[PDB]
């Protein structure tokens, strides 16, 4: 319903938040090109959801693969309304001494250069149409320290800055650009069924500021749907946190004086 | 659909963004109490919309009326799911030499003290329910100068701070608190197009950062609907700008070098 | 000697961060008018500091007293270079259920309405001078929740918003406006009471993000001195946190996993 | 006298803001190691400033050169009190279509990867000392769009994020980390030729929000001196704008309605 006839690309679409968004976009009448490098999981998802959902292999660090992915999408569906640049790799809290120069450049390539290229070539086909929507997956670490690694933190800050520059430049052509910044969702790893899922959703239940709710990838997908739809038709330049208020509080003082 | 069985109170509900939100909440199956001091406009709206929409006179500077309004809502519908604290008066850009102490205190009473009272008494009846949602109308002046008066700007910053400390305290009870900060909204004129819409586009087309779109009171109602719905069930502490990216740019530098 | 010949007004100048700044301003050659309602403490500080330091009773909620105070400063010293709008009352973390409408309005009058009046009447005499500096005492609660009460928090946000519109309007006249947002400040007992200082470090050494250092009123005064001096001659619109990084971290996640 | 006996390293110290900070540090009793890749400019400055100021060639993209530069400073002076990570190249505002993937990676290496390496190896010799200070040169583009290129902007956001997580990690060891974010300064950006000095001063006076003052490299150096001194001994995690309020205003609306 809400994305009837819209064409959307989702990088990192074969798993996690990307997969949830591909599924949600599908349920709302969108044509979605899943862009990923886990070809077996990604093609399975596209085949599983039917004719509007195609899979395209794209390593977002390779500009030629990104260029083709976008050119293929316009060729297939006539244009791209929504670019959800979501591919990235994750680092938990670490030390500056744990930062290896090669692993920093590797993460910057996937997380930040990939966002640049995905945006550049989405803009390439959106600007002539004078319409379109670019959404980046950032992270709640963009608003509070203590929940992600140094290299990762710098890369997501860089995305926020890129998102704001594009919101201005592409505003002249009627195109919006925003970020969604989730607070830790269960994804990836070996799904150590009960062991990993119970341990995660028990930690997050003590860590979160908003009690009685656990953030799932499906929750993030719904916020992406909001940003991508005409219900957000005047929303641009925004880094929208989905974090239950985690980033607005430092509870140390209150914890210390009462315990 | 999206607010089926939910009970909402809307201050400043008889006109403008409040009236638009009341109408949209009604369309989504919510029970709505319009709270205002424009008894003619407010009662007329409630009668037109039917059984689920009522009108209650409430001056938000009067704590007895604010307490009575929330207690009557529980008595009538059994609880309050959504408090949309939206009542306020507006000031365009002005000079500090124009700030009159009595007008400052009057605006603070309506804009900022009224928000405290609505949140205090909503929280009182939401906390036992272990669920609920407080949404304030702030303003895009909370993130850029140059679009609102001195007294008004300080009152809306105060609301943002209240919202963030409410998101922390009330998060322990499963309750969310957020702000919507709209930019240039056309109100007061009879919509469905008009002479009044097109020419307002004439102003905003030179002012806005996002070209080819004007913000309407109905667009803002839609963003409040998102924040108030279960689609935002892990969004809290957020001041959500609806400004087309106006607040993320100062184009003076680009303007001067391209003159 | 960084404020040689400069004229400063300090609201809430009779104690705490205000008094520390009054003393530091005096040490740097400033002429200071202490503005407060603690007449005895305030007159004593002014008498003790000498010819360049005066004292004026001024309830910042009373606009006539605020206008009179600034006009007296111009009449006495020829103008006002620095307005340190610092008067206010504090609230530690509390519940919205504790917010009393009369105490909310009382605090708003002092913390936020007083900030408007001080700034209005400073701007009035600074604009003809084409120079000057308005500095507000805000608070680190403007950038993190959990360290101040509801009413207090809203009043300090209001100050930040007021500061930013002032930086714009007064920027055209060469006038700067900034906030200082300190964290856990000792204030209370200025005289060398070691018992109270070490005990305060017992709390702050567990609460603060920057370890091995405690913030004092004299440290806040030094940061105000920077903002008020020509070393900050192009700093404007800034809410300057003095918090050791407290407001940039929520350590709950790391605490739970470790 | 304000940095008497302190040991400071300044990357990009041979020109511009870096050189200005080196001389001001020299004037305040500091021992300074100038770190740059412009060997003739840097060695000239170290010779003229005397015994306390030396020069070390260091390309900030090579971790071994950064490693050696910090070890050489410790070998000579016994430790490092101040790391002024200032090296970078600048981009004026541009279009996303102008972003070349190779140039993006080149700028990321200098601006952001270089900051990472400088901070890592400063932290290496500061953490045992239980004292120290890391200062990054970011940019006013970190708080509004419209004054820098896309690649440059994303790199300076990344620096801010890195600064925030260091202030937390290094806070437990008594070490502070901050950014200084200047607006437009006449340096090695536009040539020493006086035909470009009368023009740069004229643009900045029209563009700035604070009138009657032009930002110079010496003004920034003084703000770095504040951040690096014991006068800011409880300031950490701060991105300190030196911009005259440029980033807090979008004057478009006021410009059009009074045009
Ligand atoms: N999972 C969390 O807890 C969490 C928290 C905050 C932010 N995020 C962000 O959300 C985004 C999505 O991650 P996720 O949580 O859904 O886990 P995920 O790993 O299952 O999904 C991310 C996908 O990115 C793809 N990827 C890696 N390199 C790629 C490349 N070069 N080209 C194309 N795809 C590539 C992976 O194949 C993967 O399917 C990421 O950008 C991540 O940084 C996640
Ligand atoms: N119009 C804009 O462009 C704009 C821009 C930014 C923010 N806002 C905010 O939007 C909010 C909604 O106003 P609107 O723009 O839709 O038009 P509006 O002013 O007509 O509606 C606001 C209502 O607040 C009510 N009000 C004033 N005092 C009250 C009191 N004591 N008790 C109860 N109600 C009281 C008014 O009666 C009014 O109907 C306001 O808080 C306003 O500040 C509007
Ligand atoms: N104490 C802390 O830890 C802390 C933390 C964050 C912010 N602050 C801010 O520092 C500011 C100064 O207070 P302080 O902490 O130094 O304690 P303080 O008691 O020593 O100073 C407060 C001053 O405000 C004055 N005051 C109250 N009402 C006044 C009025 N009507 N007119 C004139 N002066 C009036 C008081 O007399 C007093 O001199 C306050 O705005 C406070 O919020 C303090
Ligand atoms: N001048 C301005 O208007 C302005 C505005 C905002 C930010 N900045 C920042 O100020 C910082 C300092 O640069 P500047 O403006 O003084 O101009 P600058 O070119 O005169 O000084 C920067 C120095 O970095 C050096 N550099 C380049 N690559 C290097 C490398 N790989 N290793 C070591 N040094 C290298 C340059 O040689 C130069 O001496 C930069 O990071 C810049 O981004 C400047
Ligand atoms: C294994 C992994 O958890 C190590 O990271 C913890 C660490 C704790 O610092 C945060 C505290 C607020 O000072 C640094 O590791 C310390 C050694 C002793 O294990 C994380 O520090 C980075 C901040 C930014 O999150
Ligand atoms: C620096 C520049 O952008 C500020 O202009 C001053 C200003 C212009 O308004 C005039 C117009 C009739 O409303 C607005 O002040 C800036 C505030 C918005 O922060 C001064 O206003 C004088 C009249 C409105 O009483
Ligand atoms: Cl935050």
Coordinates of C-alpha atoms in Angstrom, one line a residue, chain B residues 65-157:
Chain B
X65 CA -8.4 22.4 34.4
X66 CA -5.5 20.3 33.2
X67 CA -6.0 17.8 36.1
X68 CA -9.7 17.7 35.5
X69 CA -9.2 17.2 31.7
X70 CA -7.0 14.1 32.2
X71 CA -9.2 12.7 35.1
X72 CA -12.3 13.1 32.9
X73 CA -10.6 11.3 30.0
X74 CA -9.8 8.3 32.2
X75 CA -13.4 8.4 33.6
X76 CA -14.8 8.5 30.1
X77 CA -12.4 6.1 28.2
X78 CA -10.5 4.2 30.9
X79 CA -7.1 5.7 30.2
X80 CA -4.9 7.9 28.1
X81 CA -2.6 6.4 25.5
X82 CA -1.4 9.6 23.8
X83 CA -0.9 13.1 25.2
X84 CA -0.3 15.5 22.3
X85 CA 0.7 18.6 24.1
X86 CA 0.4 21.1 21.2
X87 CA -1.1 24.3 22.6
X88 CA 1.1 27.4 22.2
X89 CA 1.4 30.9 20.8
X90 CA 3.9 31.8 18.1
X91 CA 6.4 34.6 17.4
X92 CA 8.3 35.4 14.2
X93 CA 11.8 36.7 14.3
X94 CA 12.1 39.8 16.4
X95 CA 14.6 41.8 18.4
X96 CA 15.6 41.5 22.0
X97 CA 14.6 45.2 22.4
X98 CA 11.0 44.0 21.6
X99 CA 10.8 41.5 24.4
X100 CA 8.2 42.8 26.9
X101 CA 8.4 41.1 30.3
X102 CA 4.6 40.5 30.6
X103 CA 4.4 39.1 27.1
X104 CA 7.4 36.8 27.8
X105 CA 5.8 35.5 31.0
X106 CA 2.4 35.0 29.2
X107 CA 4.0 33.0 26.4
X108 CA 6.1 31.0 28.9
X109 CA 2.9 30.2 30.8
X110 CA 1.1 28.9 27.7
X111 CA 4.0 27.4 25.8
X112 CA 6.3 26.0 28.5
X113 CA 4.4 25.9 31.8
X114 CA 1.4 24.4 29.9
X115 CA 3.6 21.6 28.5
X116 CA 4.8 20.8 32.1
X117 CA 1.2 20.5 33.3
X118 CA 0.0 18.4 30.4
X119 CA 3.0 16.1 30.8
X120 CA 2.7 15.9 34.6
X121 CA -0.9 14.9 34.6
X122 CA -0.6 12.6 31.6
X123 CA 2.3 10.8 33.3
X124 CA 0.2 10.5 36.5
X125 CA -2.4 8.3 34.6
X126 CA 0.0 6.7 32.1
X127 CA 2.4 5.3 34.7
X128 CA -0.2 2.8 36.2
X129 CA -1.0 1.7 32.6
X130 CA 2.7 0.9 32.0
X131 CA 2.3 2.3 28.5
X132 CA 1.7 5.6 26.9
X133 CA 3.1 8.4 24.7
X134 CA 3.7 12.1 25.3
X135 CA 4.3 14.2 22.2
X136 CA 5.1 17.9 22.3
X137 CA 4.9 20.4 19.5
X138 CA 8.2 22.1 19.6
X139 CA 9.6 24.0 16.5
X140 CA 12.4 24.0 14.0
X141 CA 13.8 27.1 15.9
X142 CA 15.0 24.6 18.4
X143 CA 17.8 23.7 15.9
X144 CA 18.5 26.9 13.9
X145 CA 18.2 30.6 14.7
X146 CA 16.5 33.0 12.3
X147 CA 12.9 31.7 12.2
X148 CA 11.3 32.5 15.5
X149 CA 11.1 35.2 18.2
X150 CA 13.3 35.3 21.3
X151 CA 10.6 34.5 23.9
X152 CA 9.2 31.8 21.6
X153 CA 12.5 30.1 20.9
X154 CA 13.5 29.9 24.6
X155 CA 10.1 28.3 25.3
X156 CA 10.5 25.6 22.7
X157 CA 14.1 24.8 23.8

